[PDB]
Amino acid sequence: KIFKPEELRQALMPTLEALYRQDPESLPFRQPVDPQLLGIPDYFDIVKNPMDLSTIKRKLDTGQYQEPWQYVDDVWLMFNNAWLYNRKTSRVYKFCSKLAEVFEQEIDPVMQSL
Ligand SMILES: CCOc1ccc(C(C)=O)cc1-c1cc(NC(=O)c2ccco2)cc(-c2ccn(C)n2)c1
Numbered sequence: 112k113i114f115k116p117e118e119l120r121q122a123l124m125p126t127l128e129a130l131y132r133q134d135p136e137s138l139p140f141r142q143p144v145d146p147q148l149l150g151i152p153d154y155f156d157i158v159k160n161p162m163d164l165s166t167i168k169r170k171l172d173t174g175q176y177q178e179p180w181q182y183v184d185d186v187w188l189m190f191n192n193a194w195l196y197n198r199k200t201s202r203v204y205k206f207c208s209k210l211a212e213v214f215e216q217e218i219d220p221v222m223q224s225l
Contacts, residue, residue: 112178142164167185179225
């Protein structure tokens with residue numbers, strides 16, 4: 112099945128804005144992780160493939176996907192990175208898990224749609 116670029120944005124962006132809407136849980140994820148700014152200099156020794164909401168939003172704003180699981184792939188990569196780097200007890204890890212709950216709720220019916 113082919114997917115028109117304007118169609119994905121209009122049908123996938125609601126799932127993305129549902130993540131941005133989570134405050135404060137989306138705050139760690141709205142911009143790429145800057146290890147020097149954040150005081151976590153070891154981040155890239157653990158996270159080899161970074162991803163964040165702003166990169167996803169900019170991709171989606173230029174239709175730079177091809178089918179929904181591509182977008183899913185980036186969102187899950189952002190989640191997996193955060194669960195790998197941050198400790199289970201940590202605020203950012205818990206924020207990530209909240210976002211992941213919201214995202215599964217929103218993405219399951221949009222995935223059934225196409
Ligand atoms: C060192 C701890 O920061 C992090 C560590 C790891 C990760 C990841 C994604 O693995 C993310 C952050 C992080 C967290 C927060 N905000 C909160 O944690 C928060 C907000 C309210 C209560 O808590 C903000 C920003 C941020 C925002 C702008 N910039 C430039 N940076 C980055």
